[PDB]
Design a protein around this ligand. Sequence first.
Ligand code: FE7
Ligand code: MG
Length: 295
Amino acid sequence: MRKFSLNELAKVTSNFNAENKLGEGGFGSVYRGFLRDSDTYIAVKKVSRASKQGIKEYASEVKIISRLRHKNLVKLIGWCHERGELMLVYEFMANGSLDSHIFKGKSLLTWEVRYRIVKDLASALLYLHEEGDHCVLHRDIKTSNIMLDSSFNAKLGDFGLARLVDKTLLAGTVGYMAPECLSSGKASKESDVYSFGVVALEIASGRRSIEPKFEESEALLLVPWVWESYGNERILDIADRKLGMAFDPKQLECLVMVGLWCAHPSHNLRPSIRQVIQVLNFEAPLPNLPGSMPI
Ligand SMILES: CCS(=O)(=O)Nc1ccc2c(c1)/C(=C(/Nc1ccc(CN3CCCCC3)cc1)c1ccccc1)C(=O)N2
Ligand SMILES: [Mg+2]
């Protein structure tokens, strides 16, 4: 990666023209930038200085992402810290973020691609939690933070809330936050695994955690409805309607039970991400879950 000047970033984004906006990132808008000399595109995130948290999330992102290299993690390809303006530069990924496919119908993700994506995300988390000089707690795992390459391989990004292990402000995304986050404030590997659980269930079901859009059910949230479905031996009902019957039932069961295990209300009953990967690959047994979600 390298240092970009404000002027060159202005030039390649056409002064951050609205027609070049790709979407909203976690702490700024992202713009498509065109490199004339390479005939290639990049993605430029322009940081929002509208709270003080903008500069904190930029600083966290640079610090953390600089320490990470993995096939299932987004790579930083440059930065800019010049006058007041803070910016971050990444590869342009034409398939965009996972949420656009699974919730917004940009494409129909096949069962085989979805199961692969969950394994990709699990690999990323294993690397974060266990493979570095320091454990990295991500703190904002969700499908809008998962990028897709041309082959639909998944890369986890957004390190603006991420922290190295050896007091943080309570922060995160409502619908992905473990209950102990709100009661105690404490982030852990187990709180990251909770968010992974929620994501796994979103991917299986094509339903957003906070807005599942049930027509025949009164549940307002995804996880309780999945848990109730599992306890009534209705795992098949969980699967994204759009898939019809084109999915593997054994893998669906596995995905759902792993998701609930990860999303256990009690942090001490959640698996390690390494145990999750073993179960997803049928190298270790399915978890023993109660049929009712614990209160
Ligand atoms: C870690 C998540 S983040 O905070 O956003 N970080 C991030 C980091 C690197 C990135 C992107 C995002 C990104 C996006 N691409 C992108 C976006 C949209 C589209 C879709 N067309 C359709 C035509 C009109 C413009 C948008 C294509 C690529 C994108 C931007 C915002 C929201 C989501 C994706 C990309 O190519 N490289
Ligand atoms: Mg975030």
